[PDB]
Write an enzyme that holds these catalytic residues in place. Structure first.
Site, PDB file in Angstrom:
ATOM      1  N   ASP A 138      -5.329  30.741  36.040  1.00 45.32           N
ATOM      2  CA  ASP A 138      -6.014  30.801  37.402  1.00 45.32           C
ATOM      3  C   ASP A 138      -7.188  31.796  37.321  1.00 45.32           C
ATOM      4  O   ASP A 138      -7.402  32.658  38.207  1.00 45.32           O
ATOM      5  CB  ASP A 138      -4.985  31.225  38.483  1.00 45.32           C
ATOM      6  CG  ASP A 138      -5.458  30.961  39.940  1.00 45.32           C
ATOM      7  OD1 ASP A 138      -6.399  30.120  40.209  1.00 45.32           O
ATOM      8  OD2 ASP A 138      -4.802  31.584  40.838  1.00 45.32           O
ATOM      9  N   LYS A 140     -10.665  32.978  37.779  1.00 48.29           N
ATOM     10  CA  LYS A 140     -11.702  32.684  38.787  1.00 48.29           C
ATOM     11  C   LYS A 140     -12.177  34.037  39.341  1.00 48.29           C
ATOM     12  O   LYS A 140     -11.460  35.046  39.220  1.00 48.29           O
ATOM     13  CB  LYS A 140     -11.222  31.777  39.944  1.00 48.29           C
ATOM     14  CG  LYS A 140      -9.958  32.231  40.655  1.00 48.29           C
ATOM     15  CD  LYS A 140      -9.651  31.254  41.757  1.00 48.29           C
ATOM     16  CE  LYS A 140      -8.362  31.677  42.399  1.00 48.29           C
ATOM     17  NZ  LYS A 140      -8.042  30.934  43.672  1.00 48.29           N
ATOM     18  N   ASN A 143      -9.878  36.736  40.939  1.00 48.28           N
ATOM     19  CA  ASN A 143      -8.872  37.357  40.071  1.00 48.28           C
ATOM     20  C   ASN A 143      -9.448  38.289  38.995  1.00 48.28           C
ATOM     21  O   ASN A 143      -8.715  38.794  38.115  1.00 48.28           O
ATOM     22  CB  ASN A 143      -7.965  36.276  39.455  1.00 48.28           C
ATOM     23  CG  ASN A 143      -7.043  35.681  40.496  1.00 48.28           C
ATOM     24  OD1 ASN A 143      -6.668  36.392  41.478  1.00 48.28           O
ATOM     25  ND2 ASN A 143      -6.611  34.442  40.287  1.00 48.28           N
ATOM     26  N   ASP A 160      -3.195  38.645  39.014  1.00 43.85           N
ATOM     27  CA  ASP A 160      -2.610  37.377  39.459  1.00 43.85           C
ATOM     28  C   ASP A 160      -2.031  36.476  38.351  1.00 43.85           C
ATOM     29  O   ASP A 160      -2.674  35.518  37.919  1.00 43.85           O
ATOM     30  CB  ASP A 160      -3.627  36.552  40.268  1.00 43.85           C
ATOM     31  CG  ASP A 160      -2.987  35.286  40.929  1.00 43.85           C
ATOM     32  OD1 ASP A 160      -1.760  35.041  40.739  1.00 43.85           O
ATOM     33  OD2 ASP A 160      -3.739  34.549  41.596  1.00 43.85           O
ATOM     34  N   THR A 179      -7.937  26.065  41.668  1.00 40.72           N
ATOM     35  CA  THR A 179      -8.993  25.755  42.618  1.00 40.72           C
ATOM     36  C   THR A 179      -9.902  24.756  41.907  1.00 40.72           C
ATOM     37  O   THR A 179     -10.392  25.055  40.802  1.00 40.72           O
ATOM     38  CB  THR A 179      -9.853  27.024  42.918  1.00 40.72           C
ATOM     39  OG1 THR A 179      -9.007  27.975  43.542  1.00 40.72           O
ATOM     40  CG2 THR A 179     -11.098  26.718  43.832  1.00 40.72           C
TER      41      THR A 179
HETATM   42  N1  LIG Z   1      -2.727  44.668  41.397  1.00 41.43           N
HETATM   43  C1  LIG Z   1      -3.537  44.401  42.498  1.00 41.43           C
HETATM   44  N2  LIG Z   1      -4.422  45.255  43.034  1.00 41.43           N
HETATM   45  C2  LIG Z   1      -5.180  45.043  44.113  1.00 41.43           C
HETATM   46  N3  LIG Z   1      -5.131  43.865  44.768  1.00 41.43           N
HETATM   47  C3  LIG Z   1      -4.259  42.889  44.310  1.00 41.43           C
HETATM   48  C4  LIG Z   1      -3.426  43.094  43.156  1.00 41.43           C
HETATM   49  N4  LIG Z   1      -2.634  41.978  42.945  1.00 41.43           N
HETATM   50  C5  LIG Z   1      -3.005  41.097  43.910  1.00 41.43           C
HETATM   51  N5  LIG Z   1      -3.928  41.673  44.734  1.00 41.43           N
HETATM   52  C6  LIG Z   1      -4.629  41.036  45.897  1.00 41.43           C
HETATM   53  O1  LIG Z   1      -3.706  40.203  46.568  1.00 41.43           O
HETATM   54  C7  LIG Z   1      -4.121  38.812  46.438  1.00 41.43           C
HETATM   55  C8  LIG Z   1      -2.839  37.971  46.374  1.00 41.43           C
HETATM   56  O2  LIG Z   1      -2.070  38.308  45.180  1.00 41.43           O
HETATM   57  P1  LIG Z   1      -1.884  37.184  43.995  1.00 41.43           P
HETATM   58  O3  LIG Z   1      -1.164  37.886  42.854  1.00 41.43           O
HETATM   59  O4  LIG Z   1      -3.210  36.484  43.797  1.00 41.43           O
HETATM   60  O5  LIG Z   1      -0.790  36.183  44.594  1.00 41.43           O
HETATM   61  P2  LIG Z   1      -0.644  34.605  44.132  1.00 41.43           P
HETATM   62  O6  LIG Z   1       0.052  34.659  42.724  1.00 41.43           O
HETATM   63  O7  LIG Z   1       0.336  34.048  45.146  1.00 41.43           O
HETATM   64  O8  LIG Z   1      -1.979  33.899  44.212  1.00 41.43           O
HETATM   65  C9  LIG Z   1      -5.078  38.715  45.252  1.00 41.43           C
HETATM   66  O9  LIG Z   1      -5.981  37.596  45.396  1.00 41.43           O
HETATM   67  C10 LIG Z   1      -5.745  40.110  45.389  1.00 41.43           C
HETATM   68  O10 LIG Z   1      -6.664  40.038  46.538  1.00 41.43           O
HETATM   69 MG   LIG Z   2      -3.925  34.569  43.772  1.00 42.13          MG
END
Ligand SMILES: Nc1ncnc2c1ncn2[C@@H]1O[C@H](COP(=O)(O)OP(=O)(O)O)[C@@H](O)[C@H]1O
Ligand SMILES: [Mg+2]
Length: 301
Positions: A138, A140, A143, A160, A179
């Site tokens: 993923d 992009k 991330n 992510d 996406t």
């Molecule tokens: N370690 C991190 N530090 C800061 N923000 C984070 C971090 N992990 C995730 N986020 C924020 O939270 C959002 C959602 O977490 P994510 O891991 O992308 O969940 P998913 O696996 O369901 O897509 C990310 O797009 C980012 O904006």
């Molecule tokens: Mg995500």
């Protein structure tokens, strides 16, 4: 896996929301024993094998198991995991500097040399992942984040791992995810997936980083799927008039339909746009520049 059964609030004070996923919310938190800040990713458990909401035990375990294995400066680390009746909570390294593209968009101008210094750190995180046979799946802009945007040379952290998979020699993996504008033709076409899909997505990220245009994006999802499958893109002059030939060559080697013919992570690191072979190639990268006006528009969308 037994993960920690204590209440996370006994160990952390939670604060502001950082982001959210379909069945996940991510909050900043402060560990009470150290005063250090982390990110807490609260993932909603599915509840019945029969239910449609929530993430399955298999899928949460896969994300935890992958993060646990990884230790590299350009990828987030897993600090701890807790579990209650409703949620599994991953305490992750905090990436506090927001998205790379938002930081770059605050600049006046950006040469390709300056751009490759950031792109090289993405390539180093992915080289580490692929060397462990992990596909991220993923990749992009959202991330690709920055540990601390206040330093002179901000460090990239890939976040992510919710779609990440260890490649199993010996079975084929196929699935719909991601996406449309950023996935490879083999995702668009439901064909066998591997480490090559990540390489395609790096090609898309790089195309945008230089041009401010999304190469395959259509007016509808169907048109976007059809553009990706056909590899229908171009470097139009309006967008790429100051782009070096080395930069177009690097992108063209990634945006290749057949996964077997696409550039691998190890070769991307040796490509002369990343690692110039002579002073002339180095000056072409230093003099070339990103289409900043269009890039800013893209980052405000
Ligand atoms: N370690 C991190 N530090 C800061 N923000 C984070 C971090 N992990 C995730 N986020 C924020 O939270 C959002 C959602 O977490 P994510 O891991 O992308 O969940 P998913 O696996 O369901 O897509 C990310 O797009 C980012 O904006
Ligand atoms: Mg995500």
């Amino acid at each position: 896996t037994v993960f920690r059964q204590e209440n996370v609030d006994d160990y952390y004070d939670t604060g502001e929301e950082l982001g959210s996923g379909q069945f996940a919310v991510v909050k900043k938190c402060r560990e009470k024993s150290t005063g250090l800040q982390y990110a807490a990713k609260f993932i909603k458990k599915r509840r019945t094998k029969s239910s449609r909401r929530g993430v399955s035990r298999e899928d949460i375990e896969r994300e935890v198991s992958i993060l646990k294995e990884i230790q590299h400066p350009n990828v987030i680390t897993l600090h701890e995991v807790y579990e209650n009746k409703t949620d599994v909570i991953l305490i992750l390294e905090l990436v506090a500097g927001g998205e790379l593209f938002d930081f770059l968009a605050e600049k006046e101008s950006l040469t390709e040399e300056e751009a490759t210094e950031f792109l090289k750190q993405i390539l180093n995180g992915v080289y580490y992942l692929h060397s462990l046979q992990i596909a991220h799946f993923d990749l992009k802009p959202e991330n690709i984040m920055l540990l601390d945007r206040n330093v002179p040379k901000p460090r990239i952290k890939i976040i992510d791992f919710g779609l990440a998979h260890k490649i199993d020699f010996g079975n084929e993996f196929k699935n719909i995810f991601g996406t449309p504008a950023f996935v490879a033709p083999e995702i668009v076409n439901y064909e066998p997936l591997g480490l090559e899909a990540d390489m395609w997505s790096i090609g898309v990220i790089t195309y945008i980083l230089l041009s401010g245009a999304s190469p395959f994006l259509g007016d509808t999802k169907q048109e976007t799927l059809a553009n990706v499958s056909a590899v229908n893109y171009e470097f139009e002059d309006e967008y790429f008039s100051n782009t070096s030939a080395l930069a177009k060559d690097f992108i063209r080697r990634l945006l290749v339909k057949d996964p077997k013919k696409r550039m691998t992570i190890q070769d991307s690191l040796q490509h002369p746009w990343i690692k110039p072979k002579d002073t002339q190639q180095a000056l072409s990268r230093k003099a070339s520049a990103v289409n900043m006006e269009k890039f800013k528009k893209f980052a405000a969308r």
